[PDB]
Amino acid sequence: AVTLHLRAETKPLEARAALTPTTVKKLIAKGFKIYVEDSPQSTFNINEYRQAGAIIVPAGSWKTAPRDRIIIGLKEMPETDTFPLVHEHIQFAHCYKDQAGWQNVLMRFIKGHGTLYDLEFLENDQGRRVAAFGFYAGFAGAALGVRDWAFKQTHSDDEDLPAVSPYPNEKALVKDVTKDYKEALATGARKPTVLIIGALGRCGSGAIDLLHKVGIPDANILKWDIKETSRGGPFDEIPQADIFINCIYLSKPIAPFTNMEKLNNPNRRLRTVVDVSADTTNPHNPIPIYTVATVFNKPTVLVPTTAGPKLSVISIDHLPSLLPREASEFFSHDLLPSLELLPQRKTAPVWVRAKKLFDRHCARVKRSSRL
Numbered sequence: 223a224v225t226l227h228l229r230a231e232t233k234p235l236e237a238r239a240a241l242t243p244t245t246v247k248k249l250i251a252k253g254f255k256i257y258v259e260d261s262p263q264s265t266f267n268i269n270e271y272r273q274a275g276a277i278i279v280p281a282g283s284w285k286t287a288p289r290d291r292i293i294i295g296l297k298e299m300p301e302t303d304t305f306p307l308v309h310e311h312i313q314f315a316h317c318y319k320d321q322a323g324w325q326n327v328l329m330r331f332i333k334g335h336g337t338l339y340d341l342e343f344l345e346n347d348q349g350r351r352v353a354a355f356g357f358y359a360g361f362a363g364a365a366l367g368v369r370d371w372a373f374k375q376t377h378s379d380d381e382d383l384p385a386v387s388p389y390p391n392e393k394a395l396v397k398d399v400t401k402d403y404k405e406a407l408a409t410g411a412r413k414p415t416v417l418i419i420g421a422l423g424r425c426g427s428g429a430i431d432l433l434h435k436v437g438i439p440d441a442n443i444l445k446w447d448i449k450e451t452s453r454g455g456p457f458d459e460i461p462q463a464d465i466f467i468n469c470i471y472l473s474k475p476i477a478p479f480t481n482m483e484k485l486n487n488p489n490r491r492l493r494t495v496v497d498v499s500a501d502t503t504n505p506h507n508p509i510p511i512y513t514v515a516t517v518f519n520k521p522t523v524l525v526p527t528t529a530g531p532k533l534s535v536i537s538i539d540h541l542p543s544l545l546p547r548e549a550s551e552f553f554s555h556d557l558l559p560s561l562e563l564l565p566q567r568k569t570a571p572v573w574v575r576a577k578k579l580f581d582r583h584c585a586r587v588k589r590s591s592r593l
């Protein structure tokens with residue numbers, strides 16, 4: 223039987239959690255023992271975990287926990303922490319894609335004889351990820367897209383969409399979006415048309431769900447996926463839509479989805495592009511109309527068009543953080559079957575694959591300290 227210890231997040235403003243009070247309750251029902259660190263920045267109240275049966279402990283207590291506990295967290299630890307990592311850790315560590323400082327991250331595990339099971343690389347036997355955040359990335363992206371479009375109906379071009387902040391629950395977000403939307407319609411604006419590229423995936427499903435909940439008619443949504451995009455861009459449907467939401471990550475040389483030439487047109491209706499797949503490291507952006515990665519404090523950036531109405535991009539790479547509760551609940555539910563295999567981790571392929579991947583990347587690290 224396994225003991226899990228939920229590490230309080232230390233990444234600034236990280237409000238999500240790898241285990242929710244609901245998943246904790248379910249794991250305890252399956253015979254797990256669960257510690258949960260008190261965390262002020264978590265969107266979950268510590269008392270939810272207490273009612274779920276967790277043992278409540280101070281933030282950072284994982285550092286002195288018995289070596290047999292599996293330390294689970296969502297995001298990175300402070301790069302300023304240097305002490306050896308002696309536990310088995312489950313987390314996103316962001317150190318398998320040659321990220322700055324990746325060798326140092328792994329060296330902490332190496333020195334401590336610890337283990338990293340990286341959440342980004344946990345996959346089923348078919349090679350599909352067991353847990354990610356696509357649905358709420360799309361849902362939050364669509365929400366902000368509608369808000370920006372509504373803002374443009376109700377404000378002058380010299381004003382930009384103000385700072386946004388995480389919401390406590392989905393209902394609260396839908397209410398805000400719907401209020402903005404209804405105020406836009408009051409002006410004489412028509413219900414927006416929305417083009418979604420990647421409509422069939424989790425991101426697309428999430429975007430569609432938000433739109434429906436806000437009251438955007440299904441007839442106003444153009445649902446594109448590979449069938450359509452494989453024709454090759456640029457696509458006229460992009461400037462003709464009121465709002466364009468991209469869910470497909472593309473990083474190879476290919477004809478762009480749109481470009482400044484196609485956007486520089488007085489007949490363009492497009493007001494808002496939400497690139498849910500925004501990645502500042504992407505060498506080949508298929509929507510090459512922005513270079514800034516926007517953020518909650520400054521969520522939109524101007525596309526510098528020479529004709530047509532004001533156009534902005536939302537290029538936030540952490541959209542799920544707009545709805546940290548639901549994002550966590552979905553992620554943790556998706557992860558739960560794998561977590562149930564932890565007693566069997568020495569043999570269960572989902573965990574063995576992740577261990578061997580860790581081993582392989584550690585072997586890439588050559589250091590005099592290891593001699």
Ligand SMILES: O=C(O)CNC(=O)C(=O)O
Nearest residue numbers: 297314342353354355542
């Ligand atoms: O889900 C992924 O592939 C990577 N996710 C994150 O870095 C995150 O959600 O904070």
